[PDB]
Amino acid sequence: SQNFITSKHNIDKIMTNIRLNEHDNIFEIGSGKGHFTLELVQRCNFVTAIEIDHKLCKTTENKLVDHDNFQVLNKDILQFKFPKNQSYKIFGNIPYNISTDIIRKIVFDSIADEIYLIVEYGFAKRLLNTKRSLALFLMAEVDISILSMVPREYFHPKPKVNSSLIRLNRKKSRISHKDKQKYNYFVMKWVNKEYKKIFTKNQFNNSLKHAGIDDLNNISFEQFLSLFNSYKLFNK
Numbered sequence: 001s002q003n004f005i006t007s008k009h010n011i012d013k014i015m016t017n018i019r020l021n022e023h024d025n026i027f028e029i030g031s032g033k034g035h036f037t038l039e040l041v042q043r044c045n046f047v048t049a050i051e052i053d054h055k056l057c058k059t060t061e062n063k064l065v066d067h068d069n070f071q072v073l074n075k076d077i078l079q080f081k082f083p084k085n086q087s088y089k090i091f092g093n094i095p096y097n098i099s100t101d102i103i104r105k106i107v108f109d110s111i112a113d114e115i116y117l118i119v120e121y122g123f124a125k126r127l128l129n130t131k132r133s134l135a136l137f138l139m140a141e142v143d144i145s146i147l148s149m150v151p152r153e154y155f156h157p158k159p160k161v162n163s164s165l166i167r168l169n170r171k172k173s174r175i176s177h178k179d180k181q182k183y184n185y186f187v188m189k190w191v192n193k194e195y196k197k198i199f200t201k202n203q204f205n206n207s208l209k210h211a212g213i214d215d216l217n218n219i220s221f222e223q224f225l226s227l228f229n230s231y232k233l234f235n236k
């Protein structure tokens with residue numbers, strides 16, 4: 001959909017939590033009518049706006065008349081190819097219907113070291129939930145933080161639920177590239193509670209004890225990595 005945040009007053013509040021600096025190159029997902037894009041070119045070194053809506057690219061361009069450090073590409077973020085030998089960060093007020101696809105695309109198919117996104121409130125909560133697959137796959141590559149709540153009244157058309165500003169920070173991957181397959185399988189089996197397909201009854205117990213997991217309905221990412229580790233040990 002297209003839910004713009006156009007109040008200068010609200011834009012400043014949100015920018016308050018976004019610590020991007022003058023030397024960062026930025027890729028914005030969905031510049032829309034250019035409201036955040038205008039603040040990013042003033043705050044950052046350079047900004048590449050990726051907008052699917054051909055018209056909005058023009059509108060974005062008109063709003064950025066007095067600025068030079070940017071460009072607006074009329075592409076689909078889902079098919080975009082990010083730099084591989086460059087330092088850059090990402091910002092984006094994104095559509096809910098493809099948030100998953102967008103986050104997977106920018107976390108697994110880009111090397112942005114820091115990502116700022118405005119997403120649906122509930123969506124943001126699921127991202128921190130170790131009971132869901134997406135959360136576990138993402139936590140192996142980035143640290144996730146919910147920075148603030150963005151009231152639905154800040155948007156127009158006004159969505160049904162509130163949104164959240166989240167921050168994703170790249171870190172040294174906790175899963176080696178050679179364990180991608182085995183980690184993928186493990187994650188899926190664990191979130192579906194198909195314990196018997198990855199742990200014998202005794203292996204299961206020892207692993208939880210070893211990981212220090214008292215509540216099987218409340219585990220930290222660290223406790224999960226412990227499990228994935230024991231899983232490997234039991235099948236090397």
Ligand SMILES: Nc1ncnc2c1ncn2[C@@H]1O[C@H](CSCC[C@H](N)C(=O)O)[C@@H](O)[C@H]1O
Pocket residue numbers: 001002003004005006029030031032033034035036050051052053056075076077078093094095
């Ligand atoms: N797959 C995709 N690739 C690039 N842009 C997309 C996209 N799907 C939606 N968009 C664009 O992302 C925006 C979502 S709303 C964000 C509007 C803007 N940041 C503002 O508040 O002014 C729209 O401009 C929409 O056209």
